[PDB]
């Protein structure tokens, strides 16, 4: 009847300004606030943080702004025999230490076509862009870089949509960086490089030239943000998984355990 927990990002890492903390559990918690309770987050320089539940196995934590570049940041999830609801105990207690990294924002501007990587505010890379067409367009909003691949076939059907259905597809990309669990990648696009400034052609992902999606890959790291604007879609669910920025921090902050 035992709960294990999993705490990311992992000990020692080095981590961009959007990273939040993310404990995992292999049941489902019952008492969010059990489970809240037993997590102590200690940050250097200190800031204020709030716990926010994007499922009932995984609790977020982050504070109201992106991390101050050089913060360090201590998680203890302190969860042997505590009982997070309905006889469920959790199995031992976890723990991480991490640091914060350089701030690298990089901007999608569907208006110029453009995504703007800046680090601590300074231009650094302006690669033309190619995003999500009309019929299938990228959200707007902020996103969390999450894993990368070198190579990797971008599947449809990963993500429960045949590939011969009307918005599935099935092709092989290089250097691909992760910032939506609902599938958009930054990565290399051979075939629109004609269109990367000038129209939008892709099922979502933020096409790239090779050699502009091989410096992505190499230089921008889990936790650093790409914030998207002026695209014809919605704003990209704050429940993504690398969405929590697009949640307010009132709502944030008062968080959802009873929920």
């Avoid at 045949?162 to 990309?173: A, H, K, L």
Wanted: net charge negative; charged share 20%; proline share 6%.
């Amino acid at each position: 009847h035992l709960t294990m927990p999993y705490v990311m990002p992992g000990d020692g890492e080095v981590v961009g300004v959007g990273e939040p903390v993310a404990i995992r559990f292999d049941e489902n918690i019952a008492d969010r606030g059990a489970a809240e309770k037993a997590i102590k987050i200690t940050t250097n320089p200190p800031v204020e943080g709030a716990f926010y539940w994007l499922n009932n196995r995984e609790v977020r934590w982050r504070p109201e702004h992106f991390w101050k570049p050089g913060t360090a940041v201590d998680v203890a999830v302190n969860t042997y025999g505590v009982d997070l609801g309905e006889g469920m105990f959790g199995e031992d207690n976890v723990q991480t230490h991490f640091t914060i990294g350089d701030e690298v924002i990089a901007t999608a501007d569907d208006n110029t076509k453009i995504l703007t990587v800046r680090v601590n505010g300074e231009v650094v890379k302006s690669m033309p862009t190619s995003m999500g067409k009309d019929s299938t367009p990228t959200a707007n909003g902020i996103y969390i870089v999450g894993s990368r691949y070198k190579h990797i076939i971008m599947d449809s059907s990963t993500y429960g949509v045949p590939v011969n259905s009307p918005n599935g597809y099935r092709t092989d990309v290089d250097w691909a960086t992760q910032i939506s669990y609902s599938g958009v990648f930054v990565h290399s696009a051979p075939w629109s490089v004609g269109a990367q400034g000038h129209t939008n052609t892709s099922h979502g992902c933020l096409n790239v030239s090779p050699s502009n999606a091989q410096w992505f890959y190499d230089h921008v790291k889990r936790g650093d943000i790409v914030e998207v604007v002026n695209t014809v879609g919605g704003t990209l669910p704050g429940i993504d998984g690398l969405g929590d920025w697009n949640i307010p921090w009132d709502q944030w902050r008062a968080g959802n355990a009873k929920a």
